From Swiss-Prot:
Gene3D superfamilies found in the cross-reference section: Green fluorescent protein (2.40.155.10)
Documented effect of changing residue 82 to R: In Topaz; shifts the major emission and exitation peak up to 20 nm
Keyword Cell inner membrane: no
Result after altering residue 158 to V: In EBFP2.0; shifts the excitation and emission spectra to shorter wavelengths and increases quantum yields compared to BFP
Family, as annotated: Belongs to the GFP family.
Reported impact of residue 148 to H: In mut1.3; shifts fluorescence lifetime from 3.03 to 2.78 ns. In mut1.5; shifts fluorescence lifetime from 3.03 to 2.72 ns. In mut1.27; shifts fluorescence lifetime from 3.03 to 2.85 ns
Source organism: Aequorea victoria
Mutagenesis or variant effect for residue 206 to Y: Gives rise to yellow-emission variants. In EYFP; leads to yellow fluorescence, folds faster and more efficiently at 37 degrees Celsius and has superior solubility and brightness
Assigned keywords, A-Z: Chromophore, Luminescence, Photoprotein
Protein name as it appears in the record: Green fluorescent protein
InterPro entries documented for this protein: GFP, GFP-related, Green_fluorescent_prot
Use of this protein: Green fluorescent protein has been engineered to produce a vast number of variously colored mutants, fusion proteins, and biosensors. Further generation of mutants led to more stable proteins (at 37 degrees Celsius for example) with brighter fluorescence and longer fluorescence lifetimes.
Result of altering residue 36 to R: In mut1.28; shifts fluorescence lifetime from 3.03 to 2.76 ns. In mut2.2; shifts fluorescence lifetime from 3.03 to 1.94 ns. In mut3.3; shifts fluorescence lifetime from 3.03 to 1.88 ns
Length: 235
């Protein structure tokens, strides 16, 4: 029950708990790897629960560096901001999410993902290419703590592309107390030709907890993530 049928369409796709599939194929400095993830999203609470498995053995980069790569349609948009929810409005046909992630004093990830429904399942299919990493650096050397700092991300409309853009900084904690900066540049465009909601500037607030499955012998990450939109006030 929103007065905007365009909003009603997206809210209906995401009521209740929605199953999620993630499939990633990566290549970082010639180390090829794959990751499969499964879980559930509950967009009413901006809540995601996912378990990822490296299906090619040991992950050649640290799990925290892949959190942002590995479904913003599950973000909680407050009622007064639902007319700005691009991610759900592009569903079910979906959207393309592209990033370049610059690791300060190290290499970069380039990622391309298609996020869309396959039946009732929300699917995130990703290709990742990483180049120019130091083989003894914080990434290829696995020197980052297994956690994730909370942060806020500014979202802007990209009118020319009928989508959105976002640039933001992730600070990964290094095992010695320092931080490893990951500068994200992001763009999202609809897969379909139909209309989407293009947003006013706002931000997404995110918190993530990383854990392990004590019964799991494959290299894996359990992820609990909350994402909530904010920065537009209800006067």
């Amino acid at each position: 029950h929103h007065t905007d049928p365009m909003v009603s369409k997206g809210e209906e796709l995401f009521t209740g708990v929605v199953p999620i599939l993630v499939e990633l194929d990566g290549d970082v400095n010639g180390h090829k790897f794959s990751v499969s993830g499964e879980g559930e999203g509950d967009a009413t609470y901006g809540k995601l629960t996912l378990k990822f498995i490296c299906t090619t053995g040991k992950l050649p980069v640290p799990w925290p560096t892949l959190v942002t790569t590995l479904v913003l349609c599950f973000s909680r948009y407050p009622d007064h901001m639902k007319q700005h929810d691009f991610f759900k409005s592009a569903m079910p046909e979906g959207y393309v999410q592209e990033r370049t992630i610059f690791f300060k004093d190290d290499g970069n990830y380039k990622t391309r993902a298609e996020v869309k429904f396959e039946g009732d399942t929300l699917v995130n299919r990703i290709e990742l290419k990483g180049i120019d990493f130091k083989e003894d650096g914080n990434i290829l050397g696995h020197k980052l703590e297994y956690n994730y700092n909370s942060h806020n991300v500014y979202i802007m409309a990209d009118k020319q592309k009928n989508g959105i853009k976002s640039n933001f900084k992730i600070r990964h904690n290094i095992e010695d107390g320092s931080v490893q900066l990951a500068d994200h540049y992001q763009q999202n465009t609809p897969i379909g030709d139909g209309p989407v909601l293009l947003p006013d500037n706002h931000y997404l607030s995110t918190q993530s907890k990383l854990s392990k499955d004590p019964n799991e012998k494959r290299d894996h990450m359990v992820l609990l993530e909350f994402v909530t939109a904010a920065g537009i006030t209800l006067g």
